[PDB]
């Protein structure tokens, strides 16, 4: 009968409405998780950065103090 | 300078040398930290995005589930 397979229609579509609106959430949800990775990635690379800058840093003055003994053996 | 006063710099140099190296030594493990940190970090991340795209993927073959008895729906009222 023709009332039938349309209900059966009608209650296929209720169910892929409630599919692809939660196929769309996740879709947002992946965007964000991916952002905030990022963000959080950023952030390390931003401290190991700095890191690096104070250790190279401190490799100068080893530098300058090995520089400087080698001038006192020297006389 | 005076030789005693030469040789007392060289032992402060070699002093400061060694705190200089703890200090890099501090920093090396910071590093490690920081690098674990956002190891998990991003492990935590791919195991949600792993699942999400798992749910997603079952969504997606009982859509085209569904699409396919439309098809046969419209078939039968034709």
């Known amino acids: 009968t023709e009332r039938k397979l349309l209900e059966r229609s009608?209650?296929?579509?209720?169910?892929?409405?409630?599919?692809?609106?939660?196929?769309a959430e996740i879709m947002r949800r992946i965007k964000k998780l991916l952002k905030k990775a990022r963000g959080a990635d950023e952030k390390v690379l931003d401290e190991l950065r700095k890191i690096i800058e104070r250790i190279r840093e401190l490799?100068?003055?080893?530098?300058?103090?090995?520089?400087?003994?080698?001038?006192?053996?020297?006389? | 300078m005076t030789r005693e006063e030469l040789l007392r710099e060289n032992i402060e140099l070699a002093k400061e040398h060694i705190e200089i190296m703890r200090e890099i030594l501090?920093?090396?493990?910071?590093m490690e930290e920081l690098l674990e940190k956002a190891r998990g970090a991003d492990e935590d991340v791919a195991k949600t995005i792993k699942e999400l795209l798992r749910r997603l993927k079952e969504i997606i073959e009982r859509?085209?589930?569904?699409?396919?008895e439309h098809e046969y729906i419209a078939r039968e009222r034709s």
């Open chain 1, 59 to 75: 490799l100068d003055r080893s530098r300058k103090i090995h520089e400087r003994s080698e001038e006192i053996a020297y006389k």
């Open chain 1, 10 to 23: 009608r209650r296929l579509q209720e169910e892929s409405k409630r599919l692809l609106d939660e196929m």
């Open chain 2, 26 to 30: 501090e920093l090396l493990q910071k």
């Open chain 2, 63 to 68: 859509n085209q589930r569904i699409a396919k």
